[PDB]
Paper text:
Unlike HUWE1, RNF146 and TRIP12 which each possess only one [name] domain, the DTX subfamily is characterized by a tandem-[name] arrangement. In general, the binding of ADPr and ATP to [name] was found to be very weak, with affinities of 709 μM and 659 μM, respectively. To visualize the interactions of ATP with the [name] domains, we solved the crystal structures of TRIP12 and [name] in complex with ATP. The [name]-ATP structure has one ATP molecule in the WWE1 domain while WWE2 is unbound, a trend observed with our [name]-ADP structures. The ATP molecule binds the same way as ADP in the [name]-ADP structures, with the terminal phosphate group of ATP having no interactions with the protein residues. Taken together, the two ATP co-crystal structures provide a detailed characterization of TRIP12 and [name] interaction with ATP and show that the interaction with the ADP moiety of ATP is preserved. A superposition of this structure with our ATP bound structures highlights the conservation of ATP binding to the proteins, with the exception of the terminal phosphate group, which adopts different conformations based on the residues in the interacting loop.
Residue numbers in the entry: 20 to 184
Amino acid sequence: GNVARVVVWEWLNEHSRWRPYTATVCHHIENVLKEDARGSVVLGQVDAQLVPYIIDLQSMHQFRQDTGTMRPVRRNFYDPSSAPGKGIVWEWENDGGAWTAYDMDICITIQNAYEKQHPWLDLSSLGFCYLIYFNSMSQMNRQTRRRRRLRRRLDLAYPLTVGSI
Ligand SMILES: Nc1ncnc2c1ncn2[C@@H]1O[C@H](COP(=O)(O)OP(=O)(O)OP(=O)(O)O)[C@@H](O)[C@H]1O
């Protein structure tokens, strides 16, 4: 039998959290992997801001060209009914005015709460002292009460592949 699953490539950050690459980058990574299992993904070819980084598919690590520092990467899978299967992305605004995507597990949970018409979502069970309020469209830190704008966009869907069973 065949089952469909959404591919989300993730890289491990300094806070030990798996961060998603954007859908555009994930399609490029999958295309390189389909050509060669031990290839190198030059992320600068698809996103100028990621010009320092290369994904070494042989070792499954992202490395910075100028420093040699390595970060583990993973070809993760999510359900096709989840946000990345359609291209839905939830993002929060930093002090500088830039928008950052939530970690994929949190993005999926926010979208699931939003479509079930829940007024809010407490992320404390996931290990995050924050509340997402949908009527005001803002995130609030539970301990300090600081608010940040949030938004949803319809970007590109992440790659979707078949798993054989
Ligand atoms: N793919 C990526 N997308 C976005 N930010 C990234 C990516 N890879 C790493 N970063 C971030 O870049 C910053 C610097 O880490 P990087 O892996 O580039 O090099 P480094 O050698 O660890 O840097 P340094 O030791 O000088 O801080 C960190 O905040 C890290 O989370």
